[PDB]
Amino acid sequence: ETEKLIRMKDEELRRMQEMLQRMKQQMQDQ
Amino acid sequence: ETEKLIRMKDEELRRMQEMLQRMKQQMQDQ
Numbered sequence: 001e002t003e004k005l006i007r008m009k010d011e012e013l014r015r016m017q018e019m020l021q022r023m024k025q026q027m028q029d030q
Numbered sequence: 031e032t033e034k035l036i037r038m039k040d041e042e043l044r045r046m047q048e049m050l051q052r053m054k055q056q057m058q059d060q
Contacts, residue, residue, distance in 0.1 A: 002032045009039040016046040023053045030060050 002036070006032060006035055006039065009036065009043060013039060013042055013046065016043065016050065020046065020050060020053070023050065023057065027053065027057055027060075
């Protein structure tokens with residue numbers, strides 16, 4: 001549980017930072 | 031200190047989501 005929870009939230013943080021970088025690259029195209 | 035980490039990563043997830051919706055409203059301005 002608690003270890004699995006930490007690993008789940010670490011994966012989500014990675015996904016959201018990846019999504020931030022894609023939105024960053026899309027707003028530079030303007 | 032697993033419970034302190036879970037709260038830290040929950041705080042990070044919240045800030046990155048505010049930032050994503052903040053970047054979203056900036057791309058809706060284009």
